[PDB]
Amino acid sequence: ALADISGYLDVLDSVRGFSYLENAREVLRSGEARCLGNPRSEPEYVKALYVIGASRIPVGDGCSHTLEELGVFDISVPGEMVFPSPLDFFERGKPTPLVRSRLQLPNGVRVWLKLEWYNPFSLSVADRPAVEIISRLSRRVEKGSLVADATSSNFGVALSAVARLYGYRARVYLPGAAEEFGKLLPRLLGAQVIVDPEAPSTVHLLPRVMKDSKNEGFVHVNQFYNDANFEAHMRGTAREIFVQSRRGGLALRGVAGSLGTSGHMSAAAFYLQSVDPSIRAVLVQPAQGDSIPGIRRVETGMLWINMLDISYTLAEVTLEEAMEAVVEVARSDGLVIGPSGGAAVKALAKKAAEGDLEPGDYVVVVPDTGFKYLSLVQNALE
Ligand SMILES: CC(=O)OC[C@H](NCc1c(COP(=O)(O)O)cnc(C)c1O)C(=O)O
Numbered sequence: 001a002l003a004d005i006s007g008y009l010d011v012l013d014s015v016r017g018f019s020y021l022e023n024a025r026e027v028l029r030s031g032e033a034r035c036l037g038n039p040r041s042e043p044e045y046v047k048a049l050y051v052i053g054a055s056r057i058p059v060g061d062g063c064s065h066t067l068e069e070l071g072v073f074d075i076s077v078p079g080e081m082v083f084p085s086p087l088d089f090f091e092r093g094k095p096t097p098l099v100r101s102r103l104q105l106p107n108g109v110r111v112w113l114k115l116e117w118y119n120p121f122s123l124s125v126a127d128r129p130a131v132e133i134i135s136r137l138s139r140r141v142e143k144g145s146l147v148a149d150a151t152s153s154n155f156g157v158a159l160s161a162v163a164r165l166y167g168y169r170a171r172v173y174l175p176g177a178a179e180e181f182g183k184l185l186p187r188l189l190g191a192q193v194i195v196d197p198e199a200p201s202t203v204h205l206l207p208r209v210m211k212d213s214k215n216e217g218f219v220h221v222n223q224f225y226n227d228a229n230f231e232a233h234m235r236g237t238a239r240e241i242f243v244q245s246r247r248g249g250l251a252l253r254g255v256a257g258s259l260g261t262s263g264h265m266s267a268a269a270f271y272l273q274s275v276d277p278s279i280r281a282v283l284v285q286p287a288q289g290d291s292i293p294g295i296r297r298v299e300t301g302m303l304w305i306n307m308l309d310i311s312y313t314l315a316e317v318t319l320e321e322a323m324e325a326v327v328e329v330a331r332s333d334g335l336v337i338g339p340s341g342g343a344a345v346k347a348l349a350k351k352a353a354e355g356d357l358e359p360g361d362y363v364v365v366v367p368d369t370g371f372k373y374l375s376l377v378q379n380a381l382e
Pocket of ligand 1: 260338340
């Protein structure tokens with residue numbers, strides 16, 4: 001029998017660790033889930049289900065229910081694209097678009113692009129962890145309270161916006177080398193902003209954020225470590241690739257993307273590999289000495305990418321290559337992607353060249369719009 005999952009979302013604040021994820025892998029692999037006699041007594045299974053994009057739980061004794069009956073596949077978008085609030089627009093205004101590139105790759109590698117700039121607040125994939133995180137604070141953190149984090153830019157803009165929609169004030173911390181929008185848009189959205197012109201990176205900022213949190217009592221939401229990040233991509237980004245492939249009738253063979261927190265690629269890799277372990281995951285490694293906005297090398301220490309049972313393949317990419325791929329994509333598709341998108345595309349194109357890859361459809365995740373990167377565009381034009 002089917003029940004509305006929303007009555008059981010206390011399990012999100014309750015359940016700790018990664019054990020539940022074996023329930024999620026199992027249900028995804030099987031296409032079904034067993035009826036729960038006493039749903040309350042199985043917080044971890046319930047959590048696994050929410051995590052996969054279900055809106056109903058199976059309830060009763062003996063039966064089971066399909067991913068479809070569970071709502072993994074519900075259409076959320078109103079056909080007329082009319083939303084009663086910005087938040088509902090974030091929620092229901094999904095999936096982001098999966099678009100086939102006109103770009104040709106060797107060895108029968110067919111590229112689609114998932115355009116994450118189609119999120120309303122930061123015009124980036126960071127909208128998703130910002131909503132999911134803040135949403136959870138919402139129940140036990142007092143309105144009016146200040147929340148804060150290190151950001152490369154995207155996260156901070158997104159967070160600043162979502163926090164205000166929720167009653168919170170916001171503070172964002174950025175390295176000197178971050179984009180100017182990251183430093184300026186939060187203020188517009190009414191957050192405070194701190195720029196450390198010294199910090200050679202986002203992560204380098206975490207110590208001062210933590211200390212400051214201890215001192216000032218603000219809540220440090222920590223995207224780098226907060227599981228509402230990966231869970232947000234599991235139920236959004238990753239479910240969507242799954243659903244978009246099955247329904248777009250793609251013969252899905254792999255995904256490609258970049259890594260900052262590592263949240264979205266981890267979810268996409270995890271979720272899809274549960275459905276078929278042969279699904280590849282091609283990941284970018286900014287060539288050492290190079291900086292590609294929003295992303296970094298794998299061994300700089302990332303939570304989920306390392307900690308979960310995920311198969312993946314690294315490729316290096318310079319700033320110069322990532323940009324040449326912005327230009328390639330701009331000229332084929334008339335889509336202006338950002339540097340991490342460029343890199344992700346290039347990583348996919350390198351692996352294509354080596355003949356590493358089973359030929360088929362490959363979904364590349366584009367984190368944001370190239371519009372935000374005009375002086376790198378300027379540099380890439382020489
Ligand atoms: C350095 C860092 O991790 O910045 C994190 C946020 N940017 C995310 C981001 C990514 C990577 O997605 P994820 O963090 O692995 O899930 C890729 N490209 C861009 C342009 C991004 O902004 C942040 O903004 O703080």
